[PDB]
Amino acid sequence: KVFGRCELAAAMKRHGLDNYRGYSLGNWVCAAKFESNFNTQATNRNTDGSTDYGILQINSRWWCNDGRTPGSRNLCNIPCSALLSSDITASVNCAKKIVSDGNGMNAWVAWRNRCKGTDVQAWIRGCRL
Template identity: 35%
Template sequence: MMHSLALLLLCLPYLAQGYIYTKCELARDLLAENVAKSELHKWVCMAWYESSFNTAAVNQNSPNSVDHGLFQINSYWNCDPQNGKPAKNGCGHPCSDYKNTDLTDDVACIKKLKREHKGWGFSMSYTNNCQSKTSSYISECGIPGLG
């Protein structure tokens, strides 16, 4: 029992870092979450610029606003920080849901934001870095039918 506890304590710093995807792993996982092939490169690019593919990424914007996870979903507008601070929680999830490898809620939230904003305007990372990217951005991933 003590050996297991010691091993767990040794691993905690690594667990806190979350999972860091490769570009192609993320592309395949997003495809499995029904992200359209024609938009896959946009999602992967945005995740790179938002979090460097790290599911546990956190960015403190202001005292009342923190971005969470792979797509940096905002604690004021789009998730509930569950810390007593005001939140709109537009995507209907606690912020902790966006810091794991279950992409179902992340994809649903980003799709909702895309509908509400009629495109990618909600993400400055996308706007500043990904608009000119084409499917060639993920061509090395060997996903049939890209292009």
């Protein structure tokens, strides 16, 4: 599923991501665009040898288990396939664990390099949530 911009913003808000850990809703939408273009079914074979899953491209080396990544820690305690659902619940729940792991959203290099310090509200501006 490829979410509409406002559609995703609303879904993330319903799942309590707005202001979670001090991060406004705009930060999450921005990250998802750069990482997956809002595509819940996108997977990427990353530069570290593992696979990134879902709208927030969460990797199988540390966060979810796909049974194909040596040394997997499955910190989110979930199969990576759950991160490909049209229902973003699993992706949000894991994202909350990632952002609470001690480094905030810097865990997403795309957010750190492309969203951090920008007018993130621009990603929800006009959605009338």
